[PDB]
Write a protein that binds this ligand. Structure first.
Ligand SMILES: COCCOCCOCCOc1ccc(C(C)(C)CC(C)(C)C)cc1
Ligand SMILES: COCCOCCOCCOc1ccc(C(C)(C)CC(C)(C)C)cc1
Ligand SMILES: COCCOCCOCCOc1ccc(C(C)(C)CC(C)(C)C)cc1
Ligand SMILES: COCCOCCOCCOc1ccc(C(C)(C)CC(C)(C)C)cc1
Lengths: 143, 143, 143, 143
């Protein structure tokens, strides 16, 4: 159906395509962040925000993927295929999951405008080669 | 996070357990309906509704699962494990995907109130013993 | 019953496990700090603050646990069981005790707002990658 | 440090020594009384009273000591030392726990004035030799 996860929020896969893989914390770290910061709201019966909605749905998807991984580890006889499926799930799907968790948590924290400006500036920085860009990337922080 | 995907909309996993698993249409049929009725609103850059948001996220998760299934069919050589994984994905995960797609499409089309009343009425129907269970099961309609 | 030591102050065990366990100072350091800064108020006959009340109760519980440890050392003869009990007490009970002492001392000193924001920021920091977080760890300061 | 559990409220360990140790009910009975009368206030996120603030901490200390007792029963293999530890806990630390529970539940149910007057009157009654001691001891009541 050609749907973009972030077009509804004012971003675009081509905008977050620049952030590397080493930019996103682990899935456990991002889930702990989401819990400690917005658990009372995600477990709430209210439409608190589209970010909350999408974040709930993504957490449910990841839970079902973990269920799949456990089922595989328990029900597959071939260790090669089992490990291959589990590694695919974790690495590749969690890359997208981390991307989405980061986007939504960071937006809820800072602001849509702030996050999009950070994305533009980080793209400017990461497109520039090292010989002509500063060595320290831009930084989004509450400190 | 103990999150319920229907609590922000007014239902629960216990109110939708009134409906059996063989009740929900196919993922093919539900995606056909979703396209035909809300393609231009799901592809839109707007929080048209929390239902639209959740439905976008669910469709994206299902697309990622289909990608996983194709990747499995390609890479995994063990036919037993390949078929096991594909069948688990489809049957199990698509069961929940059908529940979610049904809930959101039906709500968008008819009303949260109508869908909850339909759930309680279908519970009445399916609990009624067959000797007094009418054959004309409840059904959602606009007419 | 289901009582949380912190939800009357505006925190949570989840929000204090958001920081590492190797972050919290030793029980002796925290007791020295408590003495130095608030001895006259903890020994005072006044509800100076809920923080003072909770800190009094915690210090008394830790004193009773140390009494238990000495009683074990002098009565129990099996060195295995003796050392095992003392180690359990110290490690496990002191983790919680020093989390609580840290929370309450730091609150009395800086502010509930400051301490909660510090928890959030330090967790996000220690979870963020180095190349994209500030390089210096956060720290509370009255200076 | 030298902290008194009761001078913050208007009593002392000496004013409570008028009551014998045989006087205090079981920890089970006092926790039942608490769960009956102030459960929804001890489980609340509010500084309802210093009495609640202290009773929460005491209940948590007791829970941790019960956890220690179970951990000992499991991880120890010298029943002599195991029983020594459990008995010491339940008797020695239980006496203080039930003193504190009595004091707080009473000052919450009746009041500081009533409880202190009761302590003084019971001291009179119990210092009075038996030959001149009425049987109608002072008994806290709202009737
Ligand atoms: C195997 O299923 C048994 C019945 O499960 C019903 C449980 O009720 C909650 C299910 O709700 C959902 C629906 C969809 C989903 C997501 C969005 C994760 C989609 C999926 C199943 C395609 C991964 C998660 C939970
Ligand atoms: C393999 O990594 C590629 C990097 O990402 C490229 C762009 O991907 C777009 C991200 O889109 C999605 C799609 C689905 C999801 C959900 C929420 C369904 C979660 C997932 C990945 C666990 C299935 C998240 C982001
Ligand atoms: C063995 O009993 C001797 C009687 O001693 C009573 C006077 O000592 C002070 C009592 O005050 C208390 C009350 C409670 C406590 C805490 C809160 C630490 C609870 C406990 C006893 C469960 C560890 C500590 C001291
Ligand atoms: C190994 O410990 C794990 C860390 O657990 C952190 C969460 O702890 C939940 C209980 O919290 C507390 C905190 C303090 C306390 C007091 C103050 C009573 C002191 C103690 C730990 C000496 C009993 C009791 C329970």
């Amino acid at each position: 159906m050609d749907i973009d996860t972030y077009k509804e929020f004012g971003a675009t896969v081509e905008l977050l395509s620049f952030l590397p893989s080493d930019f996103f914390p682990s899935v456990r770290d991002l889930l702990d962040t989401a819990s400690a910061l917005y658990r009372e709201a995600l477990e709430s019966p209210e439409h608190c925000s589209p970010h909350h909605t999408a974040l709930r749905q993504a957490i449910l998807c990841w839970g079902e993927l973990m269920t799949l991984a456990t089922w595989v580890g328990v029900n597959l006889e071939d260790p090669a295929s089992r490990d291959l499926v589990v590694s695919y799930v974790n690495t590749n799907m969690g890359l997208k999951f981390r991307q989405l968790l980061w986007f939504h948590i960071s937006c809820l924290t800072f602001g849509r405008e702030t996050v999009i400006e950070y994305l533009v500036s980080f793209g400017v920085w990461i497109r520039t080669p090292p010989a002509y860009r500063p060595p320290n990337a831009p930084i989004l922080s509450t400190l």
